[PDB]
Amino acid sequence: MFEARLVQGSILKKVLEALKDLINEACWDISSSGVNLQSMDSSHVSLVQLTLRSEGFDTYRCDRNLAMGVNLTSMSKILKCAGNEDIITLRAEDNADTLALVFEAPNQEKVSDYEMKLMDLDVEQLGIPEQEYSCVVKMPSGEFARICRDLSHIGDAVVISCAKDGVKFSASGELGNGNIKLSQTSNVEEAVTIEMNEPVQLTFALRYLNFFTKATPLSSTVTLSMSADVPLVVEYKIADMGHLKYYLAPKIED
């Protein structure tokens, strides 16, 4: 018997924009603590973690913890029918196998009122440990998105080198190779910053990173967290409500 009234409709739309391209179905875990979702891609190489605290919402009232399975393509389609300034209220009953969505306008004399069918999903929830990371980089989400997008035209894979001074994104194609180097900056949306415990150089499939960058409308900045033979974390902060973390395995051949 659950209902959550989100002021900034957009915040929700922008989330499904991020996910649907990477994961078709996923199970939404809702708690008095808020909305938590975790799922791997088709191919079990990338993993996505959503955390929206109940604090985040205007209303939030959850009696039974729900485990709502949804086709995110189904749900994107629904959220596309919501104005950006729309107030999005969510509602589900216990034995309910449908989720109700309610879009209130700034008009307050339009009210859309959808209702979405669910599905049953098994999803082995993976324990993500809290970790210190050899290198953590904070940089414009726009710049990151832009880098992953450009290098995809040179090569398959990006190598990220990280030192005190700066962070270097490289790819090798048939056509050539590129090295994009960014430096720690003067005065902190604009700026690049690097906590660095040891230098790190790791290799990731841009294919996936470019599904992650779909979240860049959620935050001016994004933070990359790396240690050797442990996944990359790409963290898009959600406006005080929580965060959207993408995780990707590295490579190395023979």
Binding site: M40, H44, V45, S46, L47, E124, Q125, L126, G127, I128, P129, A205, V230, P231, Y247, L248, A249, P250, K251, I252, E253
Partner: peptide
């Protein structure tokens, strides 16, 4: 090459 993040977490 590339691994599964099944390997890197679990349960």
């Amino acid at each position: 090459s590339m691994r599964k993040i099944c390997t890197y977490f679990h349960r």
